[PDB]
């Protein structure tokens, strides 16, 4: 049978701020004990690059090895659609496995970001939900966070992007907060990062209405 290779894109937030470190990650599993040292060759639009960092093989609990190579990519290259190819081989043997990845193709579209207060029926509860609807975006690569008083909020979860009838994506993020903090008039903000937003970032706030 032999090994399999999986090649993963950078995290959406990492490609949107040049101070962060976006990486493409090439993972080889089902490596055998006696397989020669696994080797990686990396290409960016077909041109070989040499700055990848490959980790020593690690045994998994199913009596196989896993080997990972990580390539730091230029933010602009990823966003401009360059193709990243990982070629996996074993030292001393001719055969290889290649995988390629790139950003999704298609005209990027800007998310529209709306915040929604708790339902009136939820106000009887000890905690309430603040909702951030993000829709109309493309590609589906996106990051959503919440904060209040300049500090990140902990207690939120965000749905995966869902494909809409017009070919763009939507999602919702739900922040749970104590009703007391909402009742006291604290302002909460949903932050969205996406390549089609001005400076790759927007924020919308909400708080209890007058």
Ligand X SMILES: *[C@@H]1O[C@H](CO[C@@H]2O[C@@H](C)[C@@H](O)[C@@H](O)[C@@H]2O)[C@@H](O[C@@H]2O[C@H](CO)[C@@H](O[C@@H]3O[C@H](CO[C@H]4O[C@H](CO)[C@@H](O)[C@H](O)[C@@H]4O[C@@H]4O[C@H](CO)[C@@H](O)[C@H](O)[C@H]4NC(C)=O)[C@@H](O)[C@H](O[C@H]4O[C@H](CO)[C@@H](O)[C@H](O)[C@@H]4O[C@@H]4O[C@H](CO)[C@@H](O)[C@H](O)[C@H]4NC(C)=O)[C@@H]3O)[C@H](O)[C@H]2NC(C)=O)[C@H](O)[C@H]1NC(C)=O
Tell me how far apart the alpha carbons of residues 127 and 165 are, in angstroms, rounded to a whole number.
34
Q: Considering CB distances under 5 to 8 angstroms, the limit depending on partner class, which of ligand X, a copy of itself, none binds residue 66?
A: ligand X
Q: Mask: binding to ligand X, 49-88, rule CB under 6 A, as x and -?
A: -----------xxx-x-x----------------------
Q: Considering CB distances under 5 to 8 angstroms, the limit depending on partner class, which of ligand X, a copy of itself, none binds residue 8?
A: ligand X
C-beta neighbour count of 108 within 10 angstroms: 16
Tell me how far apart the alpha carbons of residues 102 and 9 are, in angstroms, rounded to a whole number.
8
116 touches a copy of itself (CB under 8 A): yes
- 150 phi/psi in degrees, rounded to 5: 70, 10
Shortest Cβ 132–a copy of itself spacing (Å): 10
- Rule CB under 8 A: choose which of 25, 170, 181, 197 binds a copy of itself: 170
Shortest Cβ 28–ligand X spacing (Å): 9
133 touches a copy of itself (CB under 8 A): yes
- Residue 198 is classified by DSSP as G
206 has which bridge partners? 188
- Residue 164 is classified by DSSP as -
Residues 6+ apart with CB under 8 A from 13: 20, 143, 193
Which residues here bind ligand X, judged by CB under 6 A?
Answer: 4, 6, 8, 25, 27, 29-30, 60-62, 64, 66
């Amino acid at each position: 049978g032999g090994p399999s290779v999986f090649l993963f894109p950078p995290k959406p937030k990492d490609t949107l701020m040049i101070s962060r470190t976006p990486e493409v990650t090439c993972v080889v599993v089902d490596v055998s004990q006696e397989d020669p040292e696994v080797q990686f060759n990396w290409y960016v639009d077909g041109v070989e690059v040499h700055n990848a960092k490959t980790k020593p093989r690690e045994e998994q609990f199913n009596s196989t090895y896993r080997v990972v190579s990580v390539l730091t990519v230029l933010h602009q290259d990823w966003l401009n659609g360059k193709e990243y190819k990982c070629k996996v081989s074993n030292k001393g043997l001719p055969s290889s496995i290649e995988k390629t990845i790139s950003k999704a193709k298609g005209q990027p579209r800007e998310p529209q970001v709306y915040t929604l207060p708790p339902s009136q029926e939820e106000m009887t509860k000890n905690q309430v939900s603040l909702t951030c609807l993000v829709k109309g975006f493309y590609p589906s690569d996106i990051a959503v966070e919440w904060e209040s008083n300049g500090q990140p909020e902990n207690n939120y979860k965000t749905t995966p992007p869902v494909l809409d009838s017009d070919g763009s994506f939507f999602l919702y993020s739900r922040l749970t907060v104590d009703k007391s903090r909402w009742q006291e008039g604290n302002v909460f903000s949903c932050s969205v990062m996406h390549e089609a937003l001005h400076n790759h970032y927007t924020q919308k706030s909400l708080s209890l209405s007058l």
